[PDB]
Amino acid sequence: RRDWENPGVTQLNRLAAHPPFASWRNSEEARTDRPSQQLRSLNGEWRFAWFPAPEAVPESWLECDLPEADTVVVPSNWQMHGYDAPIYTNVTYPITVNPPFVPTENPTGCYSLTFNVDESWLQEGQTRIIFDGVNSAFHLWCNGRWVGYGQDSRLPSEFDLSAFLRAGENRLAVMVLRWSDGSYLEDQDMWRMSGIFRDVSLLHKPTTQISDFHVATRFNDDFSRAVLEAEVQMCGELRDYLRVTVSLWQGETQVASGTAPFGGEIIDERGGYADRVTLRLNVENPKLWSAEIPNLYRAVVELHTADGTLIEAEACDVGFREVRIENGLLLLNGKPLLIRGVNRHEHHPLHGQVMDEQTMVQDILLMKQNNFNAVRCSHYPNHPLWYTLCDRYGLYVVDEANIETHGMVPMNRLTDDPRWLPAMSERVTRMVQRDRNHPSVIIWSLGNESGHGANHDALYRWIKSVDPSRPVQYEGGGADTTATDIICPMYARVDEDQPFPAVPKWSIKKWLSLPGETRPLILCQYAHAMGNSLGGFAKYWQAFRQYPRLQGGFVWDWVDQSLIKYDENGNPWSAYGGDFGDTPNDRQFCMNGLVFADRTPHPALTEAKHQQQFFQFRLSGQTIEVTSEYLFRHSDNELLHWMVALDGKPLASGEVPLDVAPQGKQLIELPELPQPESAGQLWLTVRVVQPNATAWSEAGHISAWQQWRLAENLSVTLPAASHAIPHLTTSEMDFCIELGNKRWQFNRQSGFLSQMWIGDKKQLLTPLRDQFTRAPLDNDIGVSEATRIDPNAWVERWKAAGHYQAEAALLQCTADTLADAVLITTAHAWQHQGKTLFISRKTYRIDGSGQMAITVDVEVASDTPHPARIGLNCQLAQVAERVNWLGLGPQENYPDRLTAACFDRWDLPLSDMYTPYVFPSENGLRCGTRELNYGPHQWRGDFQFNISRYSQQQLMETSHRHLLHAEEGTWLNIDGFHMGIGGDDSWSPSVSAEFQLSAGRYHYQLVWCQK
Amino acid sequence: AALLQCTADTLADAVLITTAHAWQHQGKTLFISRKTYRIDGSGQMAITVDVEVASDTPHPARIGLNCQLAQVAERVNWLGLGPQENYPDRLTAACFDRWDLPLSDMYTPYVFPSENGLRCGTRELNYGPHQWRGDFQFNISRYSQQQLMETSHRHLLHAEEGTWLNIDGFHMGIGGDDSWSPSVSAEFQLSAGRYHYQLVWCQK
Amino acid sequence: DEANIETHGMVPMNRLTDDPRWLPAMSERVTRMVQRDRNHPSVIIWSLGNESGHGANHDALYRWIKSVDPSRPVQYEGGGADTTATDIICPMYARVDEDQPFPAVPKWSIKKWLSLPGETRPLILCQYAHAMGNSLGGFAKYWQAFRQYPRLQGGFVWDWVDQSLIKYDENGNPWSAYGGDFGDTPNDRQFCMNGLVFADRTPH
Ligand SMILES: O=[N+]([O-])c1ccc(O[C@@H]2O[C@H](CO)[C@H](O)[C@H](O)[C@H]2O)cc1
Ligand SMILES: O=[N+]([O-])c1ccc(O[C@@H]2O[C@H](CO)[C@H](O)[C@H](O)[C@H]2O)cc1
């Protein structure tokens, strides 16, 4: 045997790891990166049968196809084809913890393929098969004979089939185990799936071949000169006539070249490597690589006889860059980086863990368009094309070993155990051997959430010895252990310390200066974008810009891991943990992305775009100061557009070319402006626009923006006198006010506005009443469960306090006739089990112009948990197509997540006012609004609001968006005040004190009128 | 102050006065103050104040009311922070309790006179037969702000007739990280744009 | 214990302290202080003076002390507070969170200053929170930071007692005088009164 229950056996007959090969036989095709006739794909239609345990597989399958097998596409994860269920568990392992054993019932995928091999491949050289990703462990047979075995789901397994194959038809048999001892090191927080989920290929190499090659680029002090050093190793027939020529190209121009015979310098008393050769090429004024300008060269490595026969050629894209930590700072090409990063899992809602070029490209475009410059491979080596794309489009990468043992207790139980050193070593070393020549990889990581064990210290040192060009990081065991060159915490807050024993999460600003500490700090995970979140994001960015050693971080995370399911009617819907019968499970914790699984953005993405801008601005008088945060390029594809508007109405605008050097400034003086007609606030908005398309953005792409309030002329102009006075009519149960075509009815038993008529049409489906709660966000719930309440979560604190069930008690309701209006005065108390939680006192003044001015003053008991909101709500009878407001927008914005929003006049379709979070909650709020228009109504004031076809009650009771149903009418929530949403993490309260409603007394006012 | 509105209405059990004023300079409106005074059968006068402050004017030193009371009394008694002078950014040492001091203890004799003697977090203030209730900051003494500002040495101050009372809904921090560059932290500047406060003046 | 050397009014501030011809006079002010006070246990830190920029004479005297008395650290604020003549980062009036990036001698936020690239020393402000008049606004912000950051080890408030002097009026009664009140000019008026206590020891 049971090799899959033995961590001492992680492979049998597997070839050594090495950088990407294609064995070209023509150097120009190697130079151009064209396809090679010696590298074939075996992707396509294969045969597959599912078995409940390896003991159930029939021997016959080795020799021939099973009649009951299906033909399926490979690569794939078998759960995506319905064979068995994917499981969504976060920390707790999906199997009983009893290493190194796995369950007797262990889903086994039997894959097979009959394929052709040309005779020419068998007349010479070696033919190997490569499986880029097999989850979790597998045995391979060729033509009925056993070839070998492999573990590690995330790196390639290569086997020499030379002696097993025959001309023409051949048949592969692959028996894939879902669970193996490798599973104890694969406990990442993601769907647990299995299968042959990365490409399968066949590669022909000559008998005398390039078996490995390492490319290094070293520089002089100002990066005006470099030496490219390429060490090449061969296997096979070593003879004096062999040579290696390494040539370096910048496009179609050859910039350098060197040729040498094999035989490295003397290494020790026994000599040197007669099978290795190191070529050193001098390159003057090299064009440097960065995420800003991903300049690349092409190195071609030719193995050939001295007299001119090319044996084979391999090759790679080279990016000239130096990565080093000096004086506490991580520098790239001598300048300190500011990492605008994101963690990105390999996830597709239809294909599972199978990646494709299109999806990868789509992700890199969106990342770049949203001002990200870096990505962490949470938490494993990625599909090979990912690196190629990050080298070409330009993203800094953290390459991470596939080692995560989160569910152990304590977390380092395996990583501190020498018996697991061998299995861990292969996960680290084979990754470095495969990905060490990609310029996009700038930092190596030892894996994730596996505590800190002595195995990490050994491996940290192994990487530092083999590759001195990149720092090594690892967060386990407290984020600043001896196994990391970078303090790289997860979810450490900006100012707040969380002093957990043994592994405290200090405020990042305090962490940098602890006694004796000198390393740079880059969070490996920060701001958990689960549901309506990212509150407090701007606090991180202000700190990063202020403190040199705070060099950024990687947002958690890029894309929700939701999967598509289909209902009885055949309509697709987004599913999360437990939706496949999987249990135990961790429900919606698999959805923490800035974008939905189909790549549609969540609102939080625009907040990240704005805080991660590369241009900063300051305003002084008529002067705008632009500062560039690029380190290497000048602003050669950018112009500044500016607009001054009065409450939404444009008054003046222009454009100015931007010419700012990296880290430089440009002062721009705006024109003499037209002093405004009417009253209101003037606002200046500026945007940086890229006129020319790029490889990653369209012409006109906006990359940065900022707004400022300019002059304000408060209105002192009196409204005209009205030719009318509203009339009051009273009964024991109501106060009715009439003014022309308008009527208002106040219920004297409840003390609320129960109905309004315009003309003779009823406007309300439910009365206008105070609201102190919200349908809880993922951050309000945290890890709380019905089955296991977490009393410290906001939602539980509100529930326990009775907020959700408190009943309004009427303390007063009066009506008075004024000179030109009717005034209704009310007071209510909300209580629970004898405790008065809130007191609401209001006045409603309806004048002869038909406007109703509502004044609200609320008292909140200092000892009840601060409430989610202080506002009013009602179900309007009308359903209108559009929503138009003067306030922050156009996207959803909350108090602690509104920096990206701009004050202007926005107008959207109603549905755009609802955000379809998979797990429904309060959503769609827009803050800082001065006027709201819907149908015939207009509300004016200074408030926050949401408007949609779904009640807060319905959102709190429904757990999946596809189950919500539009209600009659439109539910309007208009808040004087609304609590922050939080998001530094999604398992402990994270709303900062300044965003909690703790003032005790609150005042707000609204005018509701028609038009 | 330029008057925008002054009306009176009678309600079932009270009289309501409504006023609106604008404060201007060189044709710019700096602040707009809207108030209601509601006088009831109990003799209590409830004052509601809603102020607007133009966004482009420097944030103001305070948002309150003031008057010169005709009489002088021996003690000042309040339910709020104290007993000593305290300001928004310098009130951590003060305690919420019922305090009672002689009127002169309500004036701090800084050699170079200025605004002084405020107490914050006050829910009730008693002076002679008067009582003010709300959630405000106040100072009370024999010297007008005008006098303090015009006088550079404490020995030249003279007690005015009566008692000057400044009652603030909001008051700016005093700063002090240095005394040569603005040092009041943003969180203590009156930059909210719209401010509301309410007070009840009654007799005791 | 601080040597009597302050040349604040020079332009630039280190004009004399960077001049070897002034090394002898400066040296006597440091050496004679150490010879006098080195046996007192209350003295825990020596200081090279105040507001005299940073000149090579400071570096020479810093080493002299280190050599003769290894038992006490040496500090000195001039020249940017973190020069080679100080074992403690000891700025004056650096704020808690806000940087003041003056050219050549910036005053960083203290929290940020601790972590600048390559910095490892403790930080104790030689002067902070200027208690001139109605002041000390934001004092709590410093103490919250000192308790949260191990390397922020406190500071010396500026300052203990107002430097006012007594003058007598026509009637013979005393009053508190400041700059210019003796016919002295030029003068810096009330900037001599920055204490937590009045000159007569009554507290502010
Ligand atoms: O509340 N807990 O006990 C708890 C324990 C472990 C947690 O792990 C956290 O889960 C996150 C869920 O999206 C991510 O997987 C993150 O990597 C991890 O640290 C989060 C919460
Ligand atoms: O504003 N200035 O130009 C200015 C120049 C020098 C200043 O020096 C400051 O004065 C303080 C006044 O009590 C103290 O003497 C302090 O030691 C000194 O740094 C303060 C302000």
Ligand SMILES: [Mg+2]
């Ligand atoms: Mg094994």
Ligand SMILES: [Mg+2]
């Ligand atoms: Mg050639």
Ligand SMILES: [Mg+2]
């Ligand atoms: Mg042949």
Ligand SMILES: [Mg+2]
């Ligand atoms: Mg984990």
Ligand SMILES: [Mg+2]
């Ligand atoms: Mg569960």
Ligand SMILES: [Mg+2]
């Ligand atoms: Mg003078």
Ligand code: NA
């Ligand atoms: Na930084």
Ligand code: NA
């Ligand atoms: Na998760």
Ligand code: NA
């Ligand atoms: Na430009």
Ligand code: NA
């Ligand atoms: Na819900």
Ligand code: NA
């Ligand atoms: Na004065």
Ligand code: NA
């Ligand atoms: Na400390």
Ligand code: NA
């Ligand atoms: Na002074």
